[PDB]
Amino acid sequence: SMNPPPPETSNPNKPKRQTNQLQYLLRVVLKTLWKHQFAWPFQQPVDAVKLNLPDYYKIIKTPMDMGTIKKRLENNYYWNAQECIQDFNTMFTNCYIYNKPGDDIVLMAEALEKLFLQKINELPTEE
Numbered sequence: 001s002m003n004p005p006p007p008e009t010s011n012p013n014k015p016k017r018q019t020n021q022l023q024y025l026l027r028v029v030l031k032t033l034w035k036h037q038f039a040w041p042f043q044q045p046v047d048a049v050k051l052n053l054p055d056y057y058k059i060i061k062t063p064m065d066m067g068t069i070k071k072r073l074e075n076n077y078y079w080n081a082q083e084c085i086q087d088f089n090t091m092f093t094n095c096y097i098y099n100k101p102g103d104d105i106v107l108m109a110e111a112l113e114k115l116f117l118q119k120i121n122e123l124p125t126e127e
């Protein structure tokens with residue numbers, strides 16, 4: 001069994017910026033979710049080999065996780081807040097697509113997503 005390579009976190013070809021919205025995504029959004037009791041399954045790529053989920057990357061063709069998002073924010077990968085918000089939504093959607101209502105992982109994702117929605121509702125206007 002084999003995991004795919006992780007998503008890209010560095011790419012000198014990619015355009016990027018620092019902005020106040022991206023700062024908020026790191027300081028407020030990511031750090032709020034990261035510290036939550038239910039964060040840990042989402043803090044790194046799904047290890048389908050050790051978890052014995054051999055169909056994971058058959059179903060999930062755009063993997064995403066908060067470890068990747070953390071690296072992207074720390075490494076100034078993004079051009080805008082949309083790109084980062086999309087990564088969070090990909091992560092949640094993957095979980096919902098792969099699993100079933102009521103699964104522990106789905107309940108965990110929902111708790112994180114609740115907080116995500118609350119924080120992104122107060123994303124500041126661009127400076």
Ligand SMILES: COc1cc(OC)c2c(=O)[nH]c(-c3cc(C)c(OCCN4CCCC4)c(C)c3)nc2c1
Pocket residue numbers: 040041042046051053095098099100103104105
């Ligand atoms: C450690 O980090 C992660 C991260 C993840 O996503 C971010 C996932 C993920 O999406 N799914 C699962 C996962 C989900 C279920 C339902 C599952 O089944 C339990 C037993 N079954 C229930 C009923 C009959 C028997 C098993 C073995 C694994 N594990 C993950 C682990």
